[PDB]
């Protein structure tokens, strides 16, 4: 969400008195959005709670030996018919499961 | 006022010609979304500025 979303109003709360619930309200004028509740996550309009930032940690590094372990496990279990069929492949007519073809 | 300038009179002249309704052929077009002129000013309700 953009950094400016919900904060482009100028909006002071009305304070105590006045029998309203002490939220910042939109300043003056003859429009619908005036005195109407402006900042804060629960208002119509307004920011949401903890705007998502682009400096969230999106990326994960795995150790090279862990990555290579996972490649070796993924290759070692692609040579077993039970595990390849449990992944879901239709393989009952395949001649031999480490299925190697000519280089043509 | 009965005493005007040419600038204010030309300003009022434009707002008097913008104040008409929509023509009734404009809503027979293909992609109409306009039902009425929603910028109609009445001289008692909205006081035009100045």
């Amino acid at each position: 969400v953009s950094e400016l979303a919900g904060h482009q109003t100028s909006a002071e709360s009305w304070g105590t008195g006045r029998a309203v619930a002490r939220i910042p309200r939109v300043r003056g004028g003859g429009t619908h959005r005036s005195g109407q509740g402006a900042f804060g996550n629960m208002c119509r309009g307004g920011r949401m709670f903890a705007p998502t930032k682009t400096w969230r940690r999106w990326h994960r590094r795995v150790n090279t030996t862990q990555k290579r372990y996972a490649i070796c496990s993924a290759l070692a279990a692609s040579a077993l018919p039970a595990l390849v069929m449990s992944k879901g492949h239709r393989i009952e007519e395949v001649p031999e499961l480490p299925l190697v073809v000519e280089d043509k | 006022s009965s005493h005007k300038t040419f600038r204010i009179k030309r300003f009022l002249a434009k707002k008097q010609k913008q104040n008409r309704p929509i023509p009734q052929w404009i809503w027979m077009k293909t992609g109409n979304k306009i039902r009425y002129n929603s910028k109609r000013r009445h001289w008692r309700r909205t006081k035009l500025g100045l």
Binding site: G28, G30, T31, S34 | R45, T46
Partner: peptide, 24 residues
């Protein structure tokens, strides 16, 4: 139409008002 702006409070309670005043 011009949406009426929120009710224009012009105080009466407080120390000026001589109607409803408490003890003190």
């Amino acid at each position: 139409d011009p949406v009426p702006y929120q009710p224009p409070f012009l105080c009466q309670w407080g120390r000026h008002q001589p109607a409803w005043k408490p003890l003190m």
